[PDB]
Design a protein around this ligand. Structure first.
Ligand code: ST0
Ligand code: ZN
Length: 140
């Protein structure tokens, strides 16, 4: 589990969105595994605006933050999972590292702020859903 809280937005994995998220929907994209809902309180997070390929992510199934190198956001044919079938997922970044389903929502951060959240795992890789292209999160 986990979310990003930027302004009056809450960014979560689409597959973990709650009824309250869907009842307060701003934007959602199944291909990216992302959903954004509206919040009453302002959040603590800054979104990275950059093309970094190094950062640190939180792995709940290790209670640890790991430094990683990761690929630029791409279309990755992802095998079906505990929460999704085998399919292509867009705006996905991969690193070598540990990821189980409940690790979804862990933040990946670089020197500029939050890059994305854990979205996929398996075969010794972790995938992160990028948010750095969602420029509208920074306003309104
Ligand atoms: O091993 S995967 O399932 N698929 C391969 C990844 C690159 C090309 C296909 C990978 C999907 C993202 O999360 C980590 C697992
Ligand atoms: Zn950066």
């Amino acid at each position: 589990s986990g979310a990003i809280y930027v302004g009056n937005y809450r960014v979560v994995n689409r597959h973990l969105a709650t009824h309250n998220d869907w009842a307060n929907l701003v934007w959602e994209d199944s291909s990216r595994d992302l959903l954004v809902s509206s919040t009453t309180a302002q959040g603590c997070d800054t979104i990275a605006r950059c093309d970094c390929q190094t950062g640190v992510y939180y792995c709940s199934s290790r209670r640890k933050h790991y430094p990683v190198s990761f690929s630029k956001p791409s279309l990755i044919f992802v095998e079906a999972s505990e929460y999704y079938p085998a399919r292509y997922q867009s705006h996905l970044m991969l690193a070598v590292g540990h990821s189980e389903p409940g690790d979804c929502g862990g933040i990946l951060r670089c020197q500029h702020g939050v890059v994305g959240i854990v979205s996929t795992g398996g075969n010794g890789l972790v995938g992160f859903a990028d948010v750095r292209d969602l420029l509208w999160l920074d306003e309104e």
